């Protein structure tokens, strides 16, 4: 457990700045999509129809 958690944690730390940026970017993207989810879903349904 200690060995493999060390491996995973150092891999995560190596990309720590990207790992911190991606959470905020994903949150912003998801919030922006949620603010218009209803038109998005309506439009996807209309495209399929």
């Amino acid at each position: 457990v200690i060995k493999n958690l060390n491996t995973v944690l150092d891999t995560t730390v190596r990309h720590q700045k990207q790992f911190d940026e991606t959470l905020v970017n994903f949150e912003t993207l998801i919030t922006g999509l949620k603010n218009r989810a209803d038109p998005i879903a309506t439009s996807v349904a209309d495209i399929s129809d």
């Binding site: 200690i2 944690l9 911190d20 959470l23």
Partner: protein, 52 residues
């Protein structure tokens, strides 16, 4: 007298506790550098998680 009776009572249940604590402590004590590096990496990752 109190110390004598306490040592008399809790003596037969001592060697097992000593052996168990010795084994569990040696489980971590022979991995000191690994544990400290794990704690440092966990500090970095968990600080990133908590801030966001």
């Amino acid at each position: 007298n109190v110390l004598s009776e306490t040592v008399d009572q809790t003596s037969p249940h001592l060697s097992a506790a000593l052996d168990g604590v010795a084994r569990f402590s040696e489980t971590i004590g022979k991995r000191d550098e690994d544990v400290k590096k794990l704690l440092a990496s966990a500090n970095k990752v968990a600080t990133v998680l908590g801030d966001r």
